[PDB]
Amino acid sequence: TGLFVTLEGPESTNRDYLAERLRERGIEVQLTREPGGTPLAERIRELLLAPSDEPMAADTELLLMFAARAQHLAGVIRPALARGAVVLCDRFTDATYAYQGGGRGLPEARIAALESFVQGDLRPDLTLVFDLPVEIGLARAAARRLDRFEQEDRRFFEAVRQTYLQRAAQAPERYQVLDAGLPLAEVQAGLDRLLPNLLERLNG
Amino acid sequence: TGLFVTLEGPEGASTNRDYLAERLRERGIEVQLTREPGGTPLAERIRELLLAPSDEPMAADTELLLMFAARAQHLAGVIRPALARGAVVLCDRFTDATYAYQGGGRGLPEARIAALESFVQGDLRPDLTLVFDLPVEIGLARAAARGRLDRFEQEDRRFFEAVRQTYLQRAAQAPERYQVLDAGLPLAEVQAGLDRLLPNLLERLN
Ligand SMILES: Cc1cn([C@H]2C[C@H](O)[C@@H](COP(=O)(O)O)O2)c(=O)[nH]c1=O
Ligand SMILES: Cc1cn([C@H]2C[C@H](O)[C@@H](COP(=O)(O)O)O2)c(=O)[nH]c1=O
Ligand SMILES: [Ca+2]
Ligand SMILES: [Ca+2]
Ligand SMILES: [Ca+2]
Numbered sequence: 001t002g003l004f005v006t007l008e009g010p011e012s013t014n015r016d017y018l019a020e021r022l023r024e025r026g027i028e029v030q031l032t033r034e035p036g037g038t039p040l041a042e043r044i045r046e047l048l049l050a051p052s053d054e055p056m057a058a059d060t061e062l063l064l065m066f067a068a069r070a071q072h073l074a075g076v077i078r079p080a081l082a083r084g085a086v087v088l089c090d091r092f093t094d095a096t097y098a099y100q101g102g103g104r105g106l107p108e109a110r111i112a113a114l115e116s117f118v119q120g121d122l123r124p125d126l127t128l129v130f131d132l133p134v135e136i137g138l139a140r141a142a143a144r145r146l147d148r149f150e151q152e153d154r155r156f157f158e159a160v161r162q163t164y165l166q167r168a169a170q171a172p173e174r175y176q177v178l179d180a181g182l183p184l185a186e187v188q189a190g191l192d193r194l195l196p197n198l199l200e201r202l203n204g
Numbered sequence: 205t206g207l208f209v210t211l212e213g214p215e216g217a218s219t220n221r222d223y224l225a226e227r228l229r230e231r232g233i234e235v236q237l238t239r240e241p242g243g244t245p246l247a248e249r250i251r252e253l254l255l256a257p258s259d260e261p262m263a264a265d266t267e268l269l270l271m272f273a274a275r276a277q278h279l280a281g282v283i284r285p286a287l288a289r290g291a292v293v294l295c296d297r298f299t300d301a302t303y304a305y306q307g308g309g310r311g312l313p314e315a316r317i318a319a320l321e322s323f324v325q326g327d328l329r330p331d332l333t334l335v336f337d338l339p340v341e342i343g344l345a346r347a348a349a350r351g352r353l354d355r356f357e358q359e360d361r362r363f364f365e366a367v368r369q370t371y372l373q374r375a376a377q378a379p380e381r382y383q384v385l386d387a388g389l390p391l392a393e394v395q396a397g398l399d400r401l402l403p404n405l406l407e408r409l410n
Contacts, residue, residue, distance in 0.1 A: 038260060039258070039260050040253070040258065040260055040262060040266065043253055044253070044270075047246065047249055047250065047253075052245065052246065054244060054245045054246055054281070055281075056246060056277065057276055057277055057280040057281070059276040059280070059324065060246070060273050060274075060276045060277040060280070063269055063270075063272055063273035063276055063324070064250075064269075064270070064273045066269055067265075067266050067269035067270045067273055068266075070263050070265035070266045070269060071262065071263050071266040074263040074265070074266075075260070075263070110323070113323065114323075117265075117316070117319065117320075118265060118269075
């Protein structure tokens with residue numbers, strides 16, 4: 001039956017730390033990320049992130065995101081959950097609501113229609129939102145060539161951050177919001193702290 | 205304004221699209237020629253993913269969504285703008301092929317294809333769809349004559365028979381927007397079958 005956990009936030013050792021703590025307990029952990037997660041899904045990821053002179057329609061972006069999600073769900077996520085694993089997935093449909101919804105301005109109802117179409121009843125059991133002011137995360141990206149999303153403006157990323165926060169506030173039972181700026185030791189302490197509940201979810 | 209015409213049929217083999225175009229151009233009509241999946245740089249990249257054989261099985265939902273992603277890009281970038289300027293769009297393959305290949309061939313429910321059709325296209329449908337019907341064997345041989353078989357061309361005989369039957373069923377349910385042409389006739393009988401077709405086209409335009 002497993003547990004489907006997703007990790008979200010604006011633009012790594014967090015997931016690894018959580019994975020190590022779970023494995024120590026004999027729990028199988030499947031690490032993955034979106035868009036991507038399978039060879040085909042990664043090829044779709046490439047098209048989505050590559051800058052181009054041709055404008056990508058909002059609907060195209062949304063449909064490609066969901067095409068990669070369908071492949072990833074079928075190939076990686078569902079099988080893992082069927083083995084009883086905890087899936088730790090970097091980004092999922094919350095990112096679609098934030099980026100394609102908040103950022104692009106596509107209506108929530110249309111994103112929800114595809115969510116249902118692609119996922120059926122399946123939703124993450126828990127979503128960890130690593131929150132951070134937009135400028136700091138874009139500077140982090142700027143510090144390492146920016147892809148199609150990374151090169152968007154302030155309005156865009158502010159919509160992204162606030163969409164994440166609003167969805168978490170609306171269904172607090174499904175989310176935990178963390179401050180992604182804390183000292184490493186203090187981040188890990190927060191990860192330790194959320195672990196008992198994660199295990200209660202799995203064993204529930 | 206404008207007119208949206210799609211050209212469909214069983215797998216196999218461009219010539220007719222380019223021909224009808226000539227009859228229309230000589231009348232002073234603007235014609236925009238195109239094809240799916242593809243039609244734009246990104247849509248062509250999506251075509252390449254869809255056609256490339258792989259040892260990873262592509263989920264049916266993935267195939268359907270990539271097909272409609274390319275369609276969405278193509279509609280926004282090519283089709284709607286052309287119709288807006290009053291051009292005739294002549295498009296090799298469109299959503300009928302989704303019903304035939306993803307529905308008939310893959311076995312995806314018609315309802316799910318229709319859901320995405322409405323999602324992507326809203327109310328928009330082709331004004332006229334020409335189905336170039338032909339025994340499956342002939343078309344497959346044309347497609348196989350040269351080059352490597354792509355993801356679809358690698359399929360089995362039953363898959364392509366299902367494709368053909370779906371096209372015929374759909375056309376028979378809406379005779380007003382479909383014309384079925386025998387692609388297994390002498391070029392003269394089919395070029396002239398296309399000739400006998402122009403007056404209807406031109407009228408649909410005006
Ligand atoms: C999963 C997902 C990611 N994205 C974006 C966020 C990132 O800018 C980009 C690549 O993700 P990444 O930053 O974690 O590597 O994909 C969406 O726009 N919608 C989605 O549904
Ligand atoms: C437009 C479209 C094409 N196809 C397939 C049929 C062909 O095998 C393939 C390439 O088209 P083509 O043979 O005309 O070059 O695309 C679908 O499966 N669904 C669709 O919606
Ligand atoms: Ca990024
Ligand atoms: Ca060939
Ligand atoms: Ca072919």
